[PDB]
Amino acid sequence: ITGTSTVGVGRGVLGDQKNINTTYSTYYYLQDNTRGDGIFTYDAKYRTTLPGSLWADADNQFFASYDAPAVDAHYYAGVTYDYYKNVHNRLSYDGNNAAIRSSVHYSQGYNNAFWNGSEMVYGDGDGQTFIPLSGGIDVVAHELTHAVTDYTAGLIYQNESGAINEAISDIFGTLVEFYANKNPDWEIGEDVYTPGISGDSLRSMSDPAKYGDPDHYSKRYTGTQDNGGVHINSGIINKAAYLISQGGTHYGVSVVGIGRDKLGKIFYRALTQYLTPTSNFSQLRAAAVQSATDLYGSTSQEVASVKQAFDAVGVK
Ligand SMILES: [Ca+2]
Ligand SMILES: [Ca+2]
Ligand SMILES: [Ca+2]
Ligand SMILES: [Ca+2]
Ligand SMILES: [Zn+2]
Q: How many domains does the chain fold into?
A: 2
Collect all residues with Cβ–Cβ distance below 8 Å to 65 and sequence separation of at least 6: none
**SS3 string of 104-122?**
ECCCCCCCCEEECCCCEEE
Of 121, 154, 187, the residue that ends a domain is 154
The active-site residue, picked from 143, 160, 250, 302, is: 143
* Annotated binding-site members for Zn(2+): 142, 146, 166
End-to-end CA distance of the chain: 52
Of 154, 169, 194, the last residue of a domain is: 154
What's the CATH number where 142 sits?
A: 3.10.170.10
Phi, psi of 134 (to 5 degrees): -75, -5
Task: Look at residue 179 and give its three-state secondary structure.
Answer: helix
Closest CA to 261 of 297, 296, 216, 231: 296
Kindly state whether residues 97 and 10 are assigned to the same domain.
yes
> Nearest to residue 206, comparing CAs of 230, 191, 186, 189?
186
Structure-determination technique: X-ray
Residues 6+ apart with CB under 8 A from 128: 194, 195, 196
Spatial distance between the Cα atoms of 169 and 163, rounded to a whole number of angstroms? 10
Beta-strand ranges (E) seen in the chain are: 4-11, 17-25, 27-29, 31-32, 39-43, 53-54, 56-57, 61-62, 100-104, 113-115, 120-122, 187-188, 203-204, 248-250, 253-255
Domain membership of residue 219 (yes or no) is: yes
Q: 58 and 167 share a domain?
A: no
Cα torsion at 130, 131, 134, 135 (round to 10°)?
-110
Distance (Å) from CA 136 to ligand 5 centroid: 14
- Residue 239 CA to ligand 3 center (angstroms) comes to 14
Angle at 4 between CA 10 and CA 34, to 5 degrees: 70
Check whether residue 182 and residue 289 sit in a common domain. yes
Catalytic residue of the set 88, 231, 250, 302: 231
Return binding residues.
57, 59, 61, 138, 142, 146, 166, 177, 183, 185, 187, 190, 193-194, 197, 200
Q: Which of 105, 135, 154 is the last residue of a domain?
A: 154
Resolution (A): 1.7
Q: What is the 3-state secondary structure (H, E, C) of 49-106?
A: CCCCEECEECCCEECCHHHHHHHHHHHHHHHHHHHHHHHHCCCCCCCCCCCEEEEECC
Phi and psi based region of residue 208 (left: phi greater than 0; alpha: psi -120 to 50; beta: remaining): alpha
Radius of gyration of the chain (CA): 20
Note whether residue 58 is domain-resident. Answer: yes
Domain that holds residue 274: 155-315
Residue 231 among the catalytic residues = yes
Residues 293, 307 share a domain? yes
CATH number for the domain including 207?
1.10.390.10
Q: Measured in angstroms, how far is the CA atom of residue 240 from the centroid of ligand 2?
A: 20
Report which DSSP code applies to 130: B
Q: Same structural domain for residues 52 and 33?
A: yes
Q: How far apart are CA 65 and CA 242, in angstroms?
A: 36
Same domain, 179 and 298: yes
Which residues line ion ligand 2, judged by CB < 5 Å? 183, 185
Nearest ligand, measured from the Cα of 138 = 3
The SS3 assignment for 171 reads: helix
d(CA 235, CA 15): 31
88 is catalytic: no
Ligand 5 centroid–CA 62 distance in Å is 29
Residue 313 burial (10 A CB sphere; 0-12, 13-18, 19+): buried
Residue 1 lies in a domain: no
Q: What is the residue type of 216?
A: H
In whole angstroms, give the CA distance from residue 33 to residue 214: 43
> Could you tell me the distance, in angstroms and rounded to a whole number, from the CA of residue 203 to the centre of ligand 5?
12
